[PDB]
Each structure stands twice: as C-alpha cells, then as structure tokens.
C-alpha cells in the first residue's frame, strides 16, 4: 500500500475538495468525526482506503489532504463545517488577502511569501507515509490562486519529490459562472508553467457541468454546490481504484501508463452516465448497454467537444454497481459498429475495463438519484484540443490589445511570459492536430 496526498488550492479547489471528501467518507463509512467502525485494524493498516486516510491511535481516520487558499473566507467554512473534526488544523492553510484574479499576484507576489509554509505542511503529511506515490491537485484555471499559486506549488513539488506522480483536477473557465474577465490569461499562464510538472490532468469545463445540471437534474440556475456534488461523483469514479481492491489503475503511475502515451497530451476526457434527478418520480433503470452508449454522447462529457472528429490514444471504462464483463463486451461490440471510433495507427483499438460492484454512493438530500449501475469513461482523444482552441482564441483577442496586461506586469511578471505561454499553447495545439488528423 502506497499513500496519496490531495492538495486543494483556491476557492474552486477547496470547495470541490469538500465535496469529494464528504463523498469519500460516505463511501467508506467514515463518520464526520473520523471513526470507521468496519476498520478492525485500529490505529493503522495497509488497507486500500488507507491511501487516502491515515489513522490515529484513537481510531480517527484523517484525510491525507491539504487545503490552501490565499484569503481565509472559504477555508473558514471547512473549519466550522460538518467535517471540521475530520481535518487537523495544520492542514487548512489560509492567507490574509487573495490574488485578485491575477495569476502573477498568486504566483510571484503573494505566492513567494507562503510557498515554504505550504511545502512544510505537505512534508509533515509525506513524513507519515511509508511509500508515498504522489499528489492529486485540485484548482481552477481562472482564479488567481488556482492558477498562479498552483503552478508555483507544482514546480516546487517536482523539485522536492522528483520521482512522485502528480495528477490534476482542473476547472476550465465558463462565462455562465465565471468570476473574472481575465480567466483566459490565467488559464494559459498556469497551463504553460504547469505542463511539464503534471503527469495527467482531468479537465472539467464548468460549461458542461452547468448544462448537465440543467438538462438532467432540472436545476434552473445551478450553484457551485450542485456543480461540485456532480464533479465529486466524477472524481470519486476516477479515484475509486486507488481507494478499493482491484487490479486497474491501482497506483498513480498506472494513470499515465494507461491514459497518456505522449507525455504532453496528458488531458483525458471524462464522460459520465447516468445523471438522474432525485426528483424523478418514475425512473426506468438504465442497462449496461444504455450507460455505455451514453459515454459517447458529447452532452455527457466533462468538456463539450466532438470525439468523432478526433482520434483516440487510450480508453478506460470505470463501472460502479451491477455490471458483469459479458454485458460490457456485448455493449462494446454493438457500439463499435454504430459509432465513429478511430484510434491512432500506433495504438491498439481497445478498452481497459474496471468494475466495482458497489454502486455509486449519493449524498443524502442531494440532487442525484441512486442508480443500479453507472460508468465513467476516461478517453485520451485529440478532440479535447477544441477546448484549447477556444481558450487560445479568447486569449488572443485580449492580448492583441495588451488589455489588462499592466495588472500582471505591475506584479513583477514580464510581458514576455505572456507570449511564451501562448507559444507553448500553439505547440500543444499543433501536437494534437498532427496526432489526430
């Protein structure tokens, strides 16, 4: 057994971490105080769930998690919330003033003054680890902390833990819930500086989650709470193989091995089904074939794009609930005939499959109905480059006028970092295009 440390940076990272750790506790039967009765090995163990929880002599299961934000208001809600007892004070780190939606304020100005404290708290977690495999890093692209502090922290983690894997869960910006006009700038800057320090990055476009909430949960104006419970379902679907018995995606290295053949193209697309309203009176439960088939509708992707007009480099199917292999293979056979699924020539056309018999846990009182089976597909398709296209266009529109650049230069960043980052992104877009057309 090898440990995993979760790092939540900025508002989006922290509120999504709240959602995920609530879910985690519900799934492993860990009570809000940190007591897991089914855990007979008191005070320790090398069980699967121990990769995310440590244990105290008093039988308290404590997340291997650090929450970091540059202003205090959001992490203060963790400190006074239902799961306050879960986290140990040293893990919840806050500053006095935020980054003002300014990547350079988060990276350079305010980042330089809190980075060493954060690394010290992360080291205190790592020192409780017999064999740390690495880190799961949650953050927004658009926030000043989310982008700027995150990239600084990634650089330093590559330094202080060179052989360890680093995974991202990244919130891509959408105008319907965005908070800042400069989110494209911050997105490009943090992606350029982080690219080489991340082994695998799961992008969630708030636009897609927003629309999923509206169409399938009949939420008229989704809040961060709605979005985050849905996102935390997807995240749990992705990390279940690190927290449960199995043979697929058991360590972080396997994510890269199975999903990222070319190291720069490390942005797997996530598609999830079924999303069903708790207020659906009569629901007819969906078969393996129906949920698997729904994994190929753009409307269920974490990022709206069209995988028909791209190529696949890898594809993983993570099921939860009442599923057996033959029904999976039966669904795949038919789907292959009715759908445009093209793999790159140097890759095998195939699916790695993982099944966990326990169906998804749902937050009591939440928006999601219990279902007898669910699936999350992780596919590395070049189609996701569409999202970079969108972002790089918005960036180009502002930067051609140097609009807002003065706020970044005034924090000590050089204008050249802008065009450097944009050039890296142009390289990325070309990599995708040549791999996929």
């Amino acid at each position: 057994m090898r440990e995993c440390i979760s790092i939540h940076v900025g508002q989006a990272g922290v509120q999504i971490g709240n959602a995920c750790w609530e879910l985690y506790c519900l799934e492993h039967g860990i009570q809000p105080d940190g007591q897991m009765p089914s855990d007979k090995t008191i005070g320790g163990g090398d069980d699967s769930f121990n990769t995310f929880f440590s244990e105290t002599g008093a039988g308290k299961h404590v997340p291997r998690a650090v929450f970091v934000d540059l202003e205090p208001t959001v992490i203060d809600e963790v400190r006074t919330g239902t799961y306050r007892q879960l986290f140990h004070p040293e893990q919840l780190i806050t500053g006095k003033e935020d980054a003002a939606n300014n990547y350079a304020r988060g990276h350079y100005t305010i980042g330089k003054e809190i980075i060493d404290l954060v690394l010290d708290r992360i080291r205190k977690l790592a020192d409780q680890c017999t064999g740390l495999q690495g880190f799961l890093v949650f953050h927004s692209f658009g926030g000043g902390t989310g982008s700027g502090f995150t990239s600084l922290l990634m650089e330093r983690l590559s330094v202080d833990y060179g052989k360890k894997s680093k995974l991202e869960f990244s919130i891509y910006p959408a105008p319907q819930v965005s908070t800042a006009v400069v989110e494209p700038y911050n997105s490009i800057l943090t992606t350029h500086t982080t690219l080489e320090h991340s082994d695998c990055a799961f992008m969630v476009d708030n636009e897609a989650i927003y629309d999923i909430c509206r169409r399938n949960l009949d939420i008229e104006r989704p809040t961060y709470t709605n979005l985050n419970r849905l996102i935390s379902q997807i995240v749990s679907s992705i990390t279940a193989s690190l927290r449960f018995d199995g043979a697929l995606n058991v360590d972080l290295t396997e994510f890269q091995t199975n999903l990222v053949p070319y190291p720069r193209i490390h942005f797997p697309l996530a598609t999830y089904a079924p999303v069903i309203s708790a207020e659906k009176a009569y629901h007819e439960q969906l078969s393996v074939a129906e949920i698997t088939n729904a994994c190929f509708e753009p409307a269920n992707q974490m990022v709206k794009c069209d995988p028909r007009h791209g190529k696949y480099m890898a594809c993983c199917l993570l099921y939860r609930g009442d599923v057996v292999p033959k029904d999976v293979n039966a669904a795949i056979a038919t789907i292959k005939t009715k759908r445009s699924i093209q793999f790159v020539d140097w890759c095998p056309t195939g699916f790695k499959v993982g099944i966990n018999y326990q169906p998804p846990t749902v937050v009591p009182g939440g928006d999601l109905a219990k279902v007898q089976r669910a699936v999350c597909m992780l596919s590395n398709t070049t189609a996701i480059a569409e999202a970079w296209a969108r972002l790089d266009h918005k960036f180009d529109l502002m930067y051609a006028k140097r609009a807002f650049v003065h706020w970044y230069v005034g924090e000590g960043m050089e204008e050249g970092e802008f065009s450097e980052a944009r050039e890296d992104m142009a390289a990325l877009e070309k990599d995708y295009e040549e791999v996929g057309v």
Binding site: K304, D306, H309, S340, A385, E386, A389, R390, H393
Partner: protein, 346 residues
Amino acid sequence: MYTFVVRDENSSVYAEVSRLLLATGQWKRLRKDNPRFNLMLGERNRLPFGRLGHEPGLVQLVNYYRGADKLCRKASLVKLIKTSPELSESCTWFPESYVIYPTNTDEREVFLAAYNRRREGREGNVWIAKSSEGILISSEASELLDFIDEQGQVHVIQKYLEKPLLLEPGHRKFDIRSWVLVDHLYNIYLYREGVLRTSSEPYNSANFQDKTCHLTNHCIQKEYSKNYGRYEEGNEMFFEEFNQYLMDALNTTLENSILLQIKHIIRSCLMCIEPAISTKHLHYQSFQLFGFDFMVDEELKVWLIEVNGAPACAQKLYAELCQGIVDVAISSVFPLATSIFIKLHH
C-alpha cells in the same frame, strides 16, 4: 431578431442568402469576428467548428457539416465508397476508381492488376485521372502515372465511361448537376430543378487529348469551345427540355429512367455518413448544400462522379434555391413573424 456573420464573401449562393436575410428586417449582419451570432455562413477552409455552440443564450447554426469533406474530395470519396459496407466495393453506381500518390495506402499496384485484365480482355480501356486544369484521359497507363508524378498531389484515376448518352441533335455529352440540401434534422432535400451541363462539340471517341467533347465544365466551354451556346443559352439544358427530349426521342420520363437512380444514390451516400457528421445531439447545429454530379450512360444507367461541398447554382435558379435554403435550413431553426424540394426518405 436574429444575427448572422459572413465569412465567405466569394460564395454566390450565400451572398444571395445574406441579401434575402437582411431583406426580412428580422436578421441583422454582424462583423465577421463577432461571436454573438445565431448563424454562421462559414469559410470554406478550416472552418472553426470547435468554437461553435459555446455562447450562452445563442442557438448557433452553421452552413457546413463538419466531416462532410470525406464525401466531397475525390480521393476521400473513393476511400469512403470502397471501405464502407453500406456502399461496398461492389457498388453498382460508382465507376471503378483508384487512389494514386505522386512519386515524391497507394493503389497503383492494385490498379495495374485490373488495367491489364482490361487490355487483355480486349475491353475499352480508357481511364480518366484527376485530383481536387490538369486532366488526362488516356488509353495506356504509362501516360497516366507519368502525368500524375509531374504534379505533386494525390490523384484518383477511374474507369472512363466509354458509352455515354448523347443528345441529338449534336451527338454531344453532358453531366447532370443535382442540388441537395441537408438540414439540421438531417432531412435530405433534393431541389426540383437540376441542370444539364452540356458540351457544344459532337463526341469524338478518337483522340482523347482534345478535352472539348469529353469534359463538361462550364468554364472550358465558354473559352475554348467552337459554338458555346448554339443549342442552349450558356450550354445549360434544364429539366423540362430534357424530360421532353427523353419522351420524344427515347420514350421515357426523366423521373423513371434517371431520377429514381439519382434519389437512390443521394440517399445512400448521405445516410452512409450520417452517423459521422450528424449534429442531432450536438451543442451546435449544421446544414449543408451539396452538388452531386451525375453521368448517364447510353443504357439509361446513372453514375456518380463528384460530390461538391461548396457548389454554385445556375443564374436562372439562384433566386428560388436560395429562398429555399432560407425557408428550410434557416427559418426552420430561427422562425420569422408547395415546396421546391423533394424529401428523400425510405
């Protein structure tokens, strides 16, 4: 009130569509780069599909189907027909064809295997070569591939149709242009009016170096042809005259001898690619206007040669057709405050 944006000024059909849209007082045009449009009349090259359908509060529609190029560029279409079970290498309405790459998978080593059986069986062995100006129709291969390699792009060469149907008086060749509009629901609509692009020079089966009685391009006929327009204004015979001719001279209708095959071919092609390009469940929607080019043989058998994805109309029919595009492709999605299309379904 609806907004559109015009990114292909060099398109006659959509120029006329812009005018018709403005003339309704319910459409206003925006600057080419303004992303708050309902309607995009896109550029022909590298249209940015990846940026469509991410504008909240805007239903967005575009006049091209992403992926339809597989039908509309010559090597692509041959690959699609051969490899697609719906059409198959046994397809009976598409001529034998092969994809050849210049000197600088290919298919000339599979070509020759058939060409020499044609030459031994003492069959007509004329073959035509072209890509997507620079055409060679020859009788022996070493002229064909020799020409292909002087150019530098991928080429297709296919069994020339040695026994076409010839219009009298004149003993001349022709191709049939059908216009087909696929709307956002993937209804396939064939325009009632086709056109017969004729040649003005009786058909000389002797030397295939004279392209004036073997290629039916409206361009190569106005400039380099003797009597461009002696039989029909602009070398364009429409459907009423042509049906009349088929009745008088051959004792059939255009509908029975030819149009049935044309509707079958159109529906087959478009239904075959429907799963690859449909926008039925997409965050943006597509429609597209296609030009199917057909050649009839002396047995009243129809053949498909090119599908063009950005066709122009015949000056006589611009008005009616563009108004039809507005009615069935655009107002269907964006409503305002006896149809000229035949719907293909079976």
